[model samples]
Target: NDPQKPVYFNGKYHYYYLYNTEWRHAVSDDLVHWQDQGVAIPKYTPWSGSVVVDSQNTAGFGKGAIVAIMTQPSANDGKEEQFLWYSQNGGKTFKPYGEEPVLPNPDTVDFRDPKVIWDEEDDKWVMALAEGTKIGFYESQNLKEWRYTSSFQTENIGIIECPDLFKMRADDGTYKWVLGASANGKGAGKPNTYAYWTGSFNGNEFTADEAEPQWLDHGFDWYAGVTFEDGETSYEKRYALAWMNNWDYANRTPTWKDNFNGTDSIVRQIQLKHKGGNQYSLASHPIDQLDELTESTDEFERIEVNGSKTLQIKANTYQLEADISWADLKNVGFRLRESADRKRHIDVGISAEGGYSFVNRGFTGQPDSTRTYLESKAPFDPEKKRVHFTIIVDQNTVEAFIDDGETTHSNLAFPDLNDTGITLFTENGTAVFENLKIKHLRSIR
Candidate 1:
């Protein structure tokens, strides 16, 4: 989906993305690496709502089915009118539900981004939709009928894009509702601010107890978080998926890498911090399937890294563990994906400021120009006060985990997956690396 809203159902999962020019369909069994399912909902369809697997036969498409809660721009002044399409034949084909425009935009100009959630207690489906200056709410017992519920307007939050509301367990044996939203210029902090209001939602009203909202991720990249329901087991636990958006440099992001324009970050497992007066916290990591990609260890005993020494360690979309003890910590570093000209490489190590960092070479294996990227100001501890790093390189992303994943410097550099090499170095003196292991990832035959 490449940053599109995705949902899981039947024995597989479906992804619905915001495609204004063309339609793209992708299917995944493991959520990493996908099989292109072709364009199920193509462009000119003006997709602006969510999609789900219909279970109640509400629209009467065909018993239980896979339905795309879509919008038709043809009706209601060619802006938007909610529509439904279902497939009982393995998504190879589909038909419109008997009821088209299930919940049409009332004015044909102000309604979009339907974030649907089920109120288990109220026994109905609720949706948080984007209105002109605020977000509107609608509820329904069935898919075809929606009743206007309520709308909330924030002082600075204008035009909410994607809104999500979920309940988290509290130590007091009570549940607290957390409303997450995506907005622009609402905070004095970062530009792409995805804010969340942690408070209480009593069916129709949400009471937030703060002057300013809480920033979800302080990083330069991160936006539009939505949680997929884990069947029915976890209404309390929050598992969020967000897109790593290159908002500023979207047009010039890259060709093959940005070929999809964007991609989804690893599914993050979010939970309420039991401490800090139960304030909502974001402690996220890659999914467990990453642990499956690690390979056999290529260990080095007392390897003296002088400068840019290729360890000849083999790995592919796997993890790397290196325990280094520095006698001289000045200008120490390691690298991956080294080019023959040395201009193209992925570098990581302790910074001159005693902080961990990562650097990626700016080159494209293709004929197009390359883009240089680097991140060094990662959070770290100063007690051991040094650089001990564990890194994970995925199909397109790289995470430099310093101080045992407690602090990480994340970077995105879509290398030609063929570049899999390790190198280490330091200036002014040498260092010793023990327990250095590079495991090659094994896969299903």
Candidate 2:
């Protein structure tokens, strides 16, 4: 399902998602199996929100209650209104806090998606609300009242939604703040993507070190992704997940008879990587706990590929990792979701001359479009050397990470259930694969 707002507390992960204009809550102890808790907030049309654990008895709800901040667009005479709901019983149910809008919409039709985080340095709560290509900052002592502080703006990325602000410790023992937004169908002209900036947040404002926007994922399926603060101190980690369907063709996708049409990408662990020149960027890797899902594993080394060959993975859900090296490799990659006759398959390739890595889903027996599905490329400076890939194949998705998540591309594939074959190929030259491992994953259901 489409995971919306995620909050971690009390040794459990609480996932709140939009289900038919209601906030559906689910609880998972291991992040793999989820137990549905029914609707937490109901009938909130134009549903977008954030949840936080009010640990200090803020807003007089209690000492420790789950507070939800959401927009009610159907209320307030068609003008958007922000409201609050609190839950003291471990997110099983929620109640309205007050009759008034905690933060009312300003003068724009696109003001929504409020993300609240406690500013520990200032010892207050700060709310980041998307306000049509800009983010409005506000401060609150309790959970109710808000005072507008500042606004951060960007150009060409349409009405920002799902704004998130969090801090991450860099590799150099320093900390930097990350600001993320889901842009509407014009994400710096890329359309329907999550863009972010890493910089400094001084309680009420965010200042990026660079003007260029950084994307969360290069593929079309990842959108409206938001990261949450983790409670564990053994390691500094921020977890994130996103809706795994694009707005351009979400309704048209073929998965409907089961009444399930959406899903969430794998939860990622996000960290800030200092890119020098006072510039910082976020890097994500699949959480290590996913290794527990490997029911069986297969390993191969120094396998020379001249033409084409297949891996021994016979299941539709598995994880494949490989480090491929070559002398003068022209075009080398792998084919996933392949049929027996090879008429349908998804192609992932790395081009040394082109300096890019891409995914081609044109022949995957699904609806295709050049702009939406045929091909998706992410910048990869191969430098005529080796390349590493971590590919995850689920029942309906394929996520490829290049060089341990430096660049990631996620796309949806609607291959038949019988299409579980995979092949590695080379066009002109030979390629040597080392440290190749394939692990079949367990079903969560």
Candidate 3:
């Protein structure tokens, strides 16, 4: 269930994803909940690609028509090539515009997933492609013929895929370009997440601010991510979504018993944090529209915990927010989706010994490649007096937004469905949990 191209238009957000061999469609108004539409494009074995709105009608289609250039196998040979489709009536359907591949392959087997963006500087469309370990660029005026412009290569990371490029407004009101891709960098002791680079794009080439790339997520999951411009909003508030499973153990889950195996992370509102000079980083937060999913809210004041404190609450799905302050506590955080005995609990909190915030499902009986693979981590200040975070707990997933998305962890846990206990824990010393708020969430299904 790869979440592909997304576009906001005419009071709706259209989303596409790979379902079996076809591309399925869904719509949303608030971005928190989605309404699934039937198949938008049937099985010609449509692969990944970006869908763009022909706002200027540059492709000779009517103004505001939905134009898509995607990868599909060629008729004579099975080479990956780009094909064109145009949609009217707001993407309810798509029609093939060109009988042949609009952007043909250049002797590479991995020429696919073209991310098209409208460049105001050049007044034309630019496409980004994942050609092996290199990101190739092209320019097009009519969305039909694309001319190669430049290429940027990656190092040590394995072959890249699902490439994307966009412009974002920095905190100082300056603009910068970001290029992103899905990559596996485990060989280099890095994350296999959505790695991106902040740079400058001159409508022909993308130049990075630094040679090394930064990651959007520091988690076991959160892959194939995509970001799009928010409707009527500035570039500072773009939206992002990603598939919540990784290829490492994607097919090892037991969700097939329920007739579905796909899950996605919550929608995040992303913005740039200018770190002075040429350094810039991305900070994402859960959109406030998720408040619509709250069925009930419970608030509490400062609560002191010595060793461990169990709550009366027994919920499989909810949202927890709190500020924790510690002087001598070794480990402070929550054990959620927990069993009564502590043998099957998912741990989320900061570890003073490890000097990092972590999400560990080691005791949940979930399959992991290695003993240490059961945990996902983000950087934490070990000397800090306080730390604030929000955690969303679902039936089979747990997402932690640490320091309001300065760091995030999107991990999966397939514990026994009967385990619904919640516990607050402190190690070695006492700790205070302040402004504790718990909100029971409604089922999206």
lDDT of 2: 0.78
- lDDT tens readout by residue for model 3, 292-399: 889998787688998898888777777899999889778889999889787789999998867888899898856455565688877777898688878888876788
Residue by residue across 265-309, what tens digits does model 2's lDDT show? 887887777667677667778777789999998788678998798
- lDDT string for model 1 (66-179, tens) is 666665674537765667666786564556766457787666466676777667788777777777657777888777788888887765655577777778775445567777
Best by TM-score: 3
Error of model 3, residue 15, in angstroms: 2.2
C-alpha lDDT of all candidate models, in order: 0.60, 0.78, 0.82
Candidate 1 Cα lDDT to native = 0.60
TM-score: model 3 vs. ground truth: 0.92
Instruction: Kindly report which residue stretches of model 2 are placed more than 4 angstroms away from their true locations once superposed.
Output: 2-4, 18-23, 38-46, 184-191, 250-260, 367-372
Worst 10 residues of 2 by lDDT: 365-374
Q: Regarding TM-score, does 1 or 3 come out ahead?
A: 3
**Could you tell me the TM-score of candidate 1?**
0.69
TM-score of each: 0.69, 0.91, 0.92
What's the C-alpha lDDT at position 89 in model 1?
A: 68
* lDDT score of residue 240 within candidate 3: 84
Rank by lDDT (best first):
3, 2, 1
